[PDB]
């Protein structure tokens, strides 16, 4: 007769949630907070229940972009340039303006040579160059305005601390956006960030997402200081069950670190939900030893069942 009592080995926030969740014997039927879900296979209930868990527990539910909103989000960014390394494939020489063919990590691109920043002069093809590329990238992330930080991200990339801001609506987003960017710069943070650029999809708990690299503590402290002012007025107070709350509508976690070949390109929220769905299904396919099935699935996916916002070392 405590949710922690019946769900030992699991973070309390998660134990509380699993009381809104049941899977029928045989795993052809499940129920997430009145959101019933059915399938004809155990295997298809895995994908549907994952979705129901993701909506109810991570996102909290149950087309185009906007040039006005984008213009205001674009203006809020405190910088305009992110230096970027890649290997010079070839200097192209034009009278209308010389150009550099550069292998960036994500693509081979044809860059104006006026963007070179190091070396001071186009080197031989094969030499690392460094280029002043726009910080803002409004098409990169569909549904979102994306910005890279002024300071280049570490080479091994490393573990990425995610921070989610539950903007209530577009106006709050602009303010939270600006405050968070101001804060992260001043703190010399290594990050990318993005904010919803579609005014008809607020509220969302991930209306703003910050990706902090290197040492996240300075930038997290800075952001928490900068936004706690607004936290509950501009941010709705609810957050994902899988995250560590830092304040009303301000939540944090790490990018999944699943050491299983098949698991990749999965968001934090989709990954946690999938692990949870699997454990819940494996449970239903026998006959609480239910919490153990859930605990096993989280651990196999690399999630710390006591702190699921974190991964195992």
């Amino acid at each position: 007769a405590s949710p922690v009592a019946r769900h030992r080995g699991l973070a309390p926030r998660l134990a509380e949630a699993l009381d809104a969740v049941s899977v029928a014997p045989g795993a052809r039927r499940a129920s997430v907070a009145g959101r019933t879900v059915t399938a004809d296979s155990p295997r298809d209930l895995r994908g549907r229940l994952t979705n129901a868990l993701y909506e109810e527990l991570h996102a909290g539910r149950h087309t185009l972009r906007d040039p006005a909103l984008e213009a205001r989000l674009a203006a809020a960014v405190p910088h305009r340039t992110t230096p970027t390394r890649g290997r010079l494939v070839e200097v192209l020489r034009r009278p209308d303006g010389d150009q550099l063919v550069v292998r960036l990590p994500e693509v081979t691109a044809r860059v104006p040579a006026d963007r070179l920043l190091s070396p001071s002069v186009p080197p031989a093809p094969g030499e690392t160059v460094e280029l002043a590329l726009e910080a803002a990238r409004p098409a990169l992330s569909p549904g979102f305005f994306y910005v890279m930080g002024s300071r280049p991200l570490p080479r091994p990339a490393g573990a990425v601390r995610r921070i989610f801001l539950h903007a209530r609506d577009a106006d709050a987003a602009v303010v939270l956006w600006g405050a968070a960017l101001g804060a992260l710069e001043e703190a010399a943070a290594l990050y990318h960030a993005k904010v919803l650029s579609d005014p008809q999809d607020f509220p969302r708990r991930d209306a703003v997402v910050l990706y902090l690299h290197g040492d996240h503590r300075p930038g997290e402290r800075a952001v928490t200081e900068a936004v706690s002012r607004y936290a509950g007025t501009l941010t709705g107070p609810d957050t994902s069950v899988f995250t560590e709350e830092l304040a009303p509508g301000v939540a944090a976690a790490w990018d999944p670190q699943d050491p299983r070949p098949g698991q990749s390109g999965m968001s934090f929220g989709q990954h946690r939900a999938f692990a949870l769905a699997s454990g819940l299904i494996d449970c239903a396919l026998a006959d609480p030893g239910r919490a153990e099935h859930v605990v096993r699935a989280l651990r196999e996916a690399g999630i710390d069942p006591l702190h699921p916002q974190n991964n195992l070392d």
Binding site: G47, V107, T108, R110, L133, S141
Partner: protein, 342 residues
């Protein structure tokens, strides 16, 4: 709006009836609906050169099409006027237009519609002075060596990732270079060069006649571009559109079974194409092979367009790209399998 109204006024069409106008799709701003004089029009605007090579090519088609019998499987809606300086064209509206993309999703682009489409394209390719002889930028060979930075800032993470996979596939890039090189070694024909299902429209909610539209890329060019595009559209419908996690082998198995069930659609098109262009293989024996190679590229093309709304490439995308690679690097076998032989 001003430049459009100016043209409607001068043609005797009055103005666009804002109460009944409606925007249609494509990379251009388009308007359709009734004018204050009651006439139904389709208006297209194209951004001029800082005129407008896409409208000059579209008009070069309308000039050829006006000298055609009303029995031609190839029909224009009817050009009402144009202002190429201002980037504006006006055509007769086709009442209750359903696009070939809608028909294919609904299950209505059947074998017999595919045959009429082949007849239209075969008719096209028979018809050449005053055709742009410049090469169509598809496949985009400069982009396969390096995307312009301005293009990267307008693409999704998945489109960029798809570009990168193509750029680093040396065999694919070399095959696409060979494919474009061959265009100056074959008998050319009047060609749309931008053919997809959404460039076809059928009147009367799908019960009317068949039009092929969007002649912005109309050129004297390799006929294989249009045949390949039609095959590639079916390829892409069968191995991607209908599927939108299994194993990769299961995605491949489903995709393969789905393609086989759709091969008659490509067969009908090629039947129809030969009905109206019976001398095709006599002049170009390589046409099946080249068509299959364009069908391969067309899948990459369609997969890169579809990714604009995604942040990662899903496993179906990747499986479909794998089929595209197989058709491109093995064009003689894909031609036979696709039914483009004899």
């Amino acid at each position: 709006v001003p430049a459009v109204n100016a043209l409607l006024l001068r043609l005797g069409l009055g103005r666009l009836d804002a109460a009944a106008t409606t925007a249609f799709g494509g990379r251009n701003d388009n308007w359709a609906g009734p004018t204050t004089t009651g006439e139904q029009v389709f208006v297209k605007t194209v951004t001029p050169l800082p005129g407008c090579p896409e409208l000059d090519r579209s008009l070069s088609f309308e000039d050829l099409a006006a000298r055609l019998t009303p029995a031609s499987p190839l029909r224009s809606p009817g050009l009402l006027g144009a202002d190429p300086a201002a980037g504006v064209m006006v055509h007769r509206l086709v009442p209750g237009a359903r696009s070939g993309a809608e028909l294919a999703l609904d299950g209505d682009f059947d074998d017999d519609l595919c045959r009429s489409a082949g007849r239209a394209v075969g008719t096209l390719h028979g018809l050449v002075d005053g055709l742009d002889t410049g090469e169509a930028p598809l496949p985009p060979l400069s982009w396969l060596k390096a995307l312009p930075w301005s293009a990267v800032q307008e693409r999704s993470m998945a489109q960029i990732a798809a570009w990168q996979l193509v750029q680093d596939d040396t065999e694919v890039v070399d095959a696409l270079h060979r494919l474009r090189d061959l265009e100056r070694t074959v008998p050319l024909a009047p060609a749309h060069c931008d053919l997809r299902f959404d460039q076809f429209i059928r009147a009367d909610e799908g019960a009317g006649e068949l039009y092929l539209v969007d002649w912005e890329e109309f050129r004297l060019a390799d006929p294989a571009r249009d045949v390949g595009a039609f095959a590639g559209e079916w390829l892409f419908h069968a191995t991607y559109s209908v599927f939108a996690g299994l194993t990769h082998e299961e995605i491949v198995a489903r995709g393969s079974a789905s393609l086989r069930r759709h091969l008659p659609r490509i067969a009908a098109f090629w039947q129809g194409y030969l009905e109206c262009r019976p001398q095709a293989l006599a002049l170009d024996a390589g046409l099946p092979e080249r068509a299959a190679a364009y069908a391969g590229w067309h899948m990459y093309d369609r997969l890169i367009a579809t990714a604009e709304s995604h942040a990662t490439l899903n496993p179906v995308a990747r499986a479909a790209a794998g089929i595209g690679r197989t058709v491109l690097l093995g064009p003689s076998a894909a031609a036979r399998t696709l039914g483009l032989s004899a």
